Amino acid sequence: GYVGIKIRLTDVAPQAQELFKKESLDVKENKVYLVAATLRPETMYGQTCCFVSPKIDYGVFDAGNGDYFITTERAFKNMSFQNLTPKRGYYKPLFTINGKTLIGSRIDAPYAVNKNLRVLPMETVLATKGTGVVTCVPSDSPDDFVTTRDLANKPEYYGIEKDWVQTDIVPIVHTEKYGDKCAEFLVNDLKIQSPKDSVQLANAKELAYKEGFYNGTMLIGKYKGDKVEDAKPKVKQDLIDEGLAFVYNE
Numbered sequence: 001g002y003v004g005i006k007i008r009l010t011d012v013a014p015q016a017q018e019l020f021k022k023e024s025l026d027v028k029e030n031k032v033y034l035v036a037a038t039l040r041p042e043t044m045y046g047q048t049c050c051f052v053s054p055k056i057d058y059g060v061f062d063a064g065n066g067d068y069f070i071t072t073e074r075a076f077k078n079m080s081f082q083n084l085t086p087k088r089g090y091y092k093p094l095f096t097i098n099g100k101t102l103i104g105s106r107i108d109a110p111y112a113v114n115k116n117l118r119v120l121p122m123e124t125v126l127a128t129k130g131t132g133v134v135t136c137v138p139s140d141s142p143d144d145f146v147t148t149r150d151l152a153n154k155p156e157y158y159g160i161e162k163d164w165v166q167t168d169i170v171p172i173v174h175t176e177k178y179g180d181k182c183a184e185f186l187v188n189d190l191k192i193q194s195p196k197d198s199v200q201l202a203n204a205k206e207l208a209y210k211e212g213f214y215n216g217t218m219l220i221g222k223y224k225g226d227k228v229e230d231a232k233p234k235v236k237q238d239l240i241d242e243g244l245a246f247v248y249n250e
């Protein structure tokens with residue numbers, strides 16, 4: 001039970017341009033989407049980039065009616081068994097593309113208040129989970145906060161431009177326990193120092209989940225002031241209704 005978020009690829013990285021030209025895929029007259037898997041549609045207001053893994057070969061899949069999806073082959077195969085693709089049981093990529101080739105691309109992300117978003121590398125993406133595409137919400141995701149900090153602190157080391165990473169976080173969800181940027185609060189509190197502190201990050205993630213859902217209040221968007229508990233399914237429905245998202249199961 002994930003929510004897939006359709007993140008429009010508006011200009012592809014130079015190293016990806018040769019490849020897209022070759023298969024006659026125009027990201028301007030076609031709707032090419034990176035599809036992020038989330039459990040938190042209510043956080044979409046606070047996207048600051050979209051993550052892919054340097055270590056994953058993604059497929060570019062014909063998603064029907066002029067849409068194309070960039071996910072792992074695993075996730076598009078699953079989608080083809082729940083009427084989310086043109087033909088049931090068909091999941092041949094038009095071609096494959098490695099995560100690194102996409103780094104630096106420009107994107108539009110549904111509901112994001114920040115503008116000029118980029119695709120950025122996340123080494124800690126689990127290839128077998130969701131779509132392998134992970135959207136970045138530094139205010140409320142411990143993992144996203146830790147990776148962002150690490151990208152901004154060592155940008156030359158990661159092969160990225162500093163301009164690409166947003167560090168000014170606009171608060172999205174108010175909690176009474178961890179303030180207005182619960183991911184920051186918890187990363188500081190648990191003193192998590194690397195994207196690879198898996199156990200501690202799982203702990204932080206779990207604590208942020210419970211608090212955000214039961215005690216979180218929206219600070220932005222249509223349902224500002226509302227409890228996350230009440231607002232979340234509405235935001236999710238709006239996104240689906242506007243064609244910006246869809247549900248899909250594992």
Ligand SMILES: CCNc1cc2c(cc1F)CO[B@@-]21O[C@@H]2[C@H](O1)[C@@H](COP(=O)(O)O)O[C@H]2n1cnc2c(N)ncnc21
Nearest residue numbers: 037038039040043125126129130132137140141205208209
């Ligand atoms: C407290 C968490 N906050 C939070 C979380 C997320 C977002 C905003 C937030 F403010 C946005 O998208 B989420 O991050 C996505 C998803 O929801 C959440 C579901 O994980 P789970 O099943 O609960 O363990 O982790 C991610 N995610 C999706 N795929 C991957 C992956 N392959 N590798 C690593 N992380 C992945």
